[PDB]
Amino acid sequence: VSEIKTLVTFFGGTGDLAKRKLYPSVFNLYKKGYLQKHFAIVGTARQALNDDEFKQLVRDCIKDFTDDQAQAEAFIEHFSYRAHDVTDAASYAVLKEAIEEAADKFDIDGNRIFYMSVAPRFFGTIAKYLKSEGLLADTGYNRLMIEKPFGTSYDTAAELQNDLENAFDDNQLFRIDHYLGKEMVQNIAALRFGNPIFDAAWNKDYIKNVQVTLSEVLGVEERAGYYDTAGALLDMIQNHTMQIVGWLAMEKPESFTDKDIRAAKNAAFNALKIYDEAEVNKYFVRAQYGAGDSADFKPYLEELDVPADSKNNTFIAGELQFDLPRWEGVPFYVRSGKRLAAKQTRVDIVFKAGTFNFGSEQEAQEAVLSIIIDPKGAIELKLNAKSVEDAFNTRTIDLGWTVSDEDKKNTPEPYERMIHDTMNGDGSNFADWNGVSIAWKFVDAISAVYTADKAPLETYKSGSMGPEASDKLLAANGDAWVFKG
Amino acid sequence: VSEIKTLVTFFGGTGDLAKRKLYPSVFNLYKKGYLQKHFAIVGTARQALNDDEFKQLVRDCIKDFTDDQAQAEAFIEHFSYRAHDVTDAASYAVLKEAIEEAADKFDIDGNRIFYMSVAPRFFGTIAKYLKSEGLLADTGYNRLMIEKPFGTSYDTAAELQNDLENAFDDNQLFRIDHYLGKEMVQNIAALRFGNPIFDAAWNKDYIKNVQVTLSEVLGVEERAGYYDTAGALLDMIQNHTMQIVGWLAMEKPESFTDKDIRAAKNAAFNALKIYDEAEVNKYFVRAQYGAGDSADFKPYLEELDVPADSKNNTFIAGELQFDLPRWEGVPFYVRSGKRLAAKQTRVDIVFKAGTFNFGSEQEAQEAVLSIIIDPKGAIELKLNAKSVEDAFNTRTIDLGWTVSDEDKKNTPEPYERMIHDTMNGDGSNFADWNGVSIAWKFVDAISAVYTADKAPLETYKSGSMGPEASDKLLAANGDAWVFKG
Numbered sequence A, B: 001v002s003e004i005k006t007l008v009t010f011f012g013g014t015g016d017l018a019k020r021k022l023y024p025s026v027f028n029l030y031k032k033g034y035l036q037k038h039f040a041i042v043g044t045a046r047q048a049l050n051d052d053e054f055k056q057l058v059r060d061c062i063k064d065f066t067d068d069q070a071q072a073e074a075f076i077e078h079f080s081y082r083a084h085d086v087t088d089a090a091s092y093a094v095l096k097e098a099i100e101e102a103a104d105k106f107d108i109d110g111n112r113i114f115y116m117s118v119a120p121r122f123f124g125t126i127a128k129y130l131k132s133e134g135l136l137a138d139t140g141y142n143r144l145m146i147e148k149p150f151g152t153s154y155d156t157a158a159e160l161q162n163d164l165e166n167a168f169d170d171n172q173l174f175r176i177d178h179y180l181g182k183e184m185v186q187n188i189a190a191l192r193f194g195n196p197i198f199d200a201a202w203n204k205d206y207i208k209n210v211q212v213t214l215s216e217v218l219g220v221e222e223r224a225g226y227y228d229t230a231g232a233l234l235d236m237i238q239n240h241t242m243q244i245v246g247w248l249a250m251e252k253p254e255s256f257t258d259k260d261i262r263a264a265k266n267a268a269f270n271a272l273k274i275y276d277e278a279e280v281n282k283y284f285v286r287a288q289y290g291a292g293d294s295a296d297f298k299p300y301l302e303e304l305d306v307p308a309d310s311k312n313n314t315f316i317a318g319e320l321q322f323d324l325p326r327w328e329g330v331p332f333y334v335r336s337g338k339r340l341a342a343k344q345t346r347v348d349i350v351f352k353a354g355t356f357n358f359g360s361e362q363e364a365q366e367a368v369l370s371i372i373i374d375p376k377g378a379i380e381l382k383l384n385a386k387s388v389e390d391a392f393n394t395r396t397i398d399l400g401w402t403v404s405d406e407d408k409k410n411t412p413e414p415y416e417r418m419i420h421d422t423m424n425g426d427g428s429n430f431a432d433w434n435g436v437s438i439a440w441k442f443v444d445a446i447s448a449v450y451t452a453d454k455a456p457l458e459t460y461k462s463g464s465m466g467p468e469a470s471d472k473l474l475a476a477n478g479d480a481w482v483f484k485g
Helices: A016-032 A051-061 A069-076 A091-105 A120-132 A154-164 A183-193 A224-249 A258-269 A277-283 A405-410 A414-424 A433-451 A468-475 B016-031 B051-065 B069-076 B089-106 B120-132 B154-167 B187-194 B224-249 B258-269 B277-283 B405-410 B414-424 B433-451 B468-475
Strands: A006-011 A039-045 A079-083 A112-116 A142-146 A173-175 A207-215 A284-289 A315-320 A332-337 A344-351 A368-374 A378-386 A394-402 A458-460 B006-011 B039-045 B079-083 B112-116 B142-146 B173-175 B207-215 B284-292 B315-320 B332-337 B344-351 B368-374 B378-386 B394-402 B458-462
Touching (some): A006 A091, A039 A091, A051 A079, A120 A154, A183 B378, A207 A224, A224 A258, A224 A284, A378 B187, A394 B378, B016 B051, B016 B414, B079 B089, B089 B120, B120 B142, B187 B368, B224 B332, B224 B433, B258 B433, B277 B284, B277 B433, B284 B468
Parallel strands (some): A112 A142, A207 A332, B006 B112, B142 B173
Antiparallel strands (some): A315 A332, A368 A378, A394 B394
16 A cells, blocks of 8 residues: 555544554554554644653553554654643744654655544644644645534534634545444445445335434433533434434435535535424424433433533434435434433434235235444345245334454454545545534524423433424324334 | 134145155144144055055055144145046046035035146146036135146147136136245345335346256255156256246336236246247257266266166256347346256346446456345345455455245244135245247257257256356356355
């Protein structure tokens, strides 16, 4: 494989994300051979660490993935560290020098990546300074990887965006959503555009409805401080869920390049219907988990650091609608929540049942294409066939496929994908501004009615699949969730 | 279950088919509760057997199909036997009498089924006398189950047809082909018409070619006497293969009633291209098996009873063409033979590859839907998805399904399915005159050039999938056998 020549600077280089996700990913790119001699990693944070202490930190964080000592040592010598106060303009001069020193040491020509893994208050500030203090390279590329969240409403986001646009063009910005980095999620376009039988049926004439489910068995754990102000709505729906929908609802692109893909996705989002108060009430459900069946499952209000009057949503179920011919009348059902029956990230495409009557007791039911993303990749197709009875009758059978052991071992972890893609300058698995702005516009309309408490807050017992209102939502259209736990 | 009131007479009631399959099947119908009290089975052959030894013959045969010995005995009590010579009109009175006795003893009002399980030469005769000697019931129905509808030649076949329509009404004729009775063959229509995504692609816009394979590992064994003049052409192609093609190539029927199904099938059969001499040479391959790698897999010309000059075909592969708008340009490849790599009856529908450019190393390949009929039922769908590599690329994966233990344990045997259907007077799974007629004309066109030795006789290693001329047939259209052995 060809060598990738880059200089990566991590803001927030001592946080857990960097320690357990980022460095090991970068190390993998090294093992694979993409990273060879012309590369350097400059870590930065507020604590007073130094080069020796940083290399040691890195060494410990990748010890579990090392083949041999020499390999780790060779890798480690490409890192350097600079303590740095993101608000201090002068501090940037120290960083600029570290970067230039590293660029000279390993002969790196531009190609800089700045990874922001710090509190979001600093996103705009760091951006402006990168330009001011002359940290941006004069040749090669300059790219910014921005960690979640990306604002907390359309306003904050737009504001963030405006700030970012001072030193970067939208196509150099890489907003991170690790679900877009999962292998199975990337199989969607292949399945659809690579098989005419599905490609031709990916529209309102064959699809009854689309279902997206991101369910977790865990509760609020120990992140109540942050979660209580975000809820399933901002933590799971606005970002992960919406971006998966984008892959599903997209129009057929001119070609498979990042530019056409985003264009194809943007056309769908532009057709997304934004709701008013009555509609949010009609099409969405918000709930909070109650007690379960064991002394481990406390109702949400009894969790650590959760205010006693909390009206936060730990579960959201809703219907999206697209004003594009392709999707006329096909509801996209979306759901995500904590304390549900199982851990599962999946997509289920329910096809309209056939009208040909066999004159049997059980006529043809709806076929279903299911793509399981988490916990283990699997694809299943529920099809109508003949029952094993004396009189002709139909039944539903499931053809299945699941990742092999070899598939698992060769699957790159999402952060490796993202970093590698950013190095290649491929925007295929990243959302662009148009996509993010629409998601915010859509979600704001919902939040607005929630904060004003203009919609019920349902309960559901820990261990189920949500409030009964969730089922009632699909029932109105003669639909039902295919995954029942 | 409802009790079925019927009287079934078996001509050839001491032959292998009766012993091994007919009797055990009727028994299954009894155990399942369809056959309760108002029923009788009258057997008949040349040999002078008495009620005791005949009942004993049935007992020996359903012995391993009985759980409770009591139900066995209770079943046995409904049988009666009469020695009878089919050619002597006089002895039909003995039969006629026996029939009436059993009818009055068990209170069966008409509803007679006559199963002709004897050599074909006798069918015409038995039919005429059934009407002549007044064996046909007064009230209820009268139905004929003809074991070998094709007869031994188009002429005799046509002749028998003549006799039958001049004495019986067509809805009383049940032309047998046990393959139509196989559970998986009956799933084909359910899969196609029961699923819009498949129903809509069942034509030339999506299908590249259809393959039908009926392979066997055994050689001629101890049937050289019959096989040497029949060959795979008459033994497997003319009958079983053709009936399967029928289910595949049929047009979409108006409804799922046997009348519309037959019309739909016939639209395909009448559109089948019958070949002249040049075309047989172009589209068909005949071959005879040579020695295998192992020891006792000797060449066909060395089997104990095969004449030195034998030019018999133990393998046929060919291309069928239907002149219907939905099948324009799609070849139907058929192959059947002895001493091939494995025992298998299956259909493989190859879909044209998509044309979407992913910009990958491996673009989309052809999807394939496979229906395994023997040894065990299975349905597989090879689809294009994403490979597990750093760069985006496609690969084919296989979604599969196979019959469960419960399914195969509740699956009726072909003969039970057929007898039951005849009782119900349902002709959907039986061959009709037009299909039988066409199959004959089709085959006779091929036999003519073969008996005139105007086409080559290929050789193939026993244990392989046939001569390479079989692969060349498909390669001419850029196709290849999916089943590799």
